[PDB]
Design a protein around this ligand. Sequence first.
Ligand SMILES: [Zn+2]
Ligand SMILES: [Zn+2]
Ligand SMILES: [Zn+2]
Ligand SMILES: [Zn+2]
Lengths: 301, 299
Amino acid sequence: PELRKDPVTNRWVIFSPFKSKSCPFCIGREQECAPELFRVPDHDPNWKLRVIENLYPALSRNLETRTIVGFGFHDVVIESPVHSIQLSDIDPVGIGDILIAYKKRINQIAQHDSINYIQVFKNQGASAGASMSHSHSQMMALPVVPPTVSSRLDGTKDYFEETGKCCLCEAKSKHFVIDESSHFVSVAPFAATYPFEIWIIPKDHSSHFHHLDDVKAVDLGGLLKLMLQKIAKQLNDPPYNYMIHTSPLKVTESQLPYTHWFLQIVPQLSGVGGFEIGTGCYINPVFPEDVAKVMREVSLT
Amino acid sequence: QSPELRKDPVTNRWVIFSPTDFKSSCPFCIECAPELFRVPDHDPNWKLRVIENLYPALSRNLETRTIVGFGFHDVVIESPVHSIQLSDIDPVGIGDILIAYKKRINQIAQHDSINYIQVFKNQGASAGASMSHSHSQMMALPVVPPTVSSRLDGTKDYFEETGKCCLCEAKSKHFVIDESSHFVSVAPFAATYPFEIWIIPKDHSSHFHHLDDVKAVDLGGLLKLMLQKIAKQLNDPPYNYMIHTSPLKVTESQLPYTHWFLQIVPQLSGVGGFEIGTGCYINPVFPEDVAKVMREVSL
Ligand SMILES: [Zn+2]
Ligand SMILES: [Zn+2]
Ligand SMILES: [Zn+2]
Ligand SMILES: [Zn+2]
């Protein structure tokens, strides 16, 4: 039983020692959705993916200007034409296309000075927040830098000032390696917030996700797919969430040395209670050392 | 209504608002882990008792990038009767629960290794409640938790700019639901969760255990009132409530802007990748409306 902390989360977690507990988005029903931003391949009727506006946005894109107006961008990335397909089934190249699509939309949004952070995330399973069965992910552009981002900046800065190094650049030395690709490495975070949480860290120190090129997008697409399929097997296809942790749009040169983006995957295996809500501190039932060994021994035969 | 971002010194974080539309024997009975004390003192016909948690999150037997899992994890059995819910207990009986917390808090405070104590209650399996018997818990931590740090920072920034304690302005900053002799319940302005309710003491006090017997019964009544109204208006949803107090080593300098309170959160919805990734929440109901609906509810 012990408390562990990491510059990235900049918060203590308690470790105290597992399985899971057509449609308007399909090709042909495009008018059934909200205005399209673009698709892939470009303007092709036989599309592999498309990004559209979210019909009922959390933040409205039509309000550009103690409280702040709800302006922001809430877009939806339809990951496939086929309804029965799950992001995990798509081929490495097809995922890379999804990853490149994010980059594209991120670059467009970056043109607005009113935006300070963009959150790319994926929900699979109703209990994990996924309102629809069709494979899809989302993008939320916020006018403010979110708490996790602020905390991260603070933590990685404190660590950088004391060691002169970027915690994520030491992924293989600070965390527990599960798998590794050509440009990325997946690990079980040392001070992981959730049981069986997995981070996919780029091996090259880059401060923002959209700095990703086509070669790395396919290479990342493969590691992501491998991590999702192993999760699905070892944990019995549990619902899950993955989110891209990148830098704010106005990130400073001064912050660059210790700002390194990554992708977080969290399989839903348990909920929270009054302790968590009240403290912001979580209780992880499984150490990452064990999650690492289990995920390394899992096979897809 | 139209979307808005709202922030409050207490949470020190932005929440996104985007919209009466909402809705939803045993070993603890009079065999358990070591007892700390009971009420009335050492009485076989007890109303409540606090014991050790059989499978603690933090072990009390470890006193000393990582820190040993030392800490105190205790369980407060709120009643002898299994079928009773905290909400059914009379105002005086709850006050007893509240005084028992204070008692245990005072004992724990004797340890310099502890920096924060989290008192919380879980009702309903989906809300973290492992057992049906009415009970709450206490977790003593060797570190000051994120929400406490954030709150200290937010209420400090606000105090430096206005020279006032945000919670002392409960009636003016938030939306009043009900009021008792020494407390007032409100729908927080920048509430994290839909139908979130805060019960704020009217007297500026930095720590919960500074509460006396008169206020404990008066608070017991307001708390009971808020739980029963929630149960009615929302169709008996699971819920969580937690006491937000000051760190054990809170400084004199922090005192003017450190004001404790009790947070009640009815479980009406879960989170997704957006929340986990940003730490920012999406609230579907403004507090103005929560306030009006809770004020019109009748028991
Ligand atoms: Zn579909
Ligand atoms: Zn780095
Ligand atoms: Zn019982
Ligand atoms: Zn005050």
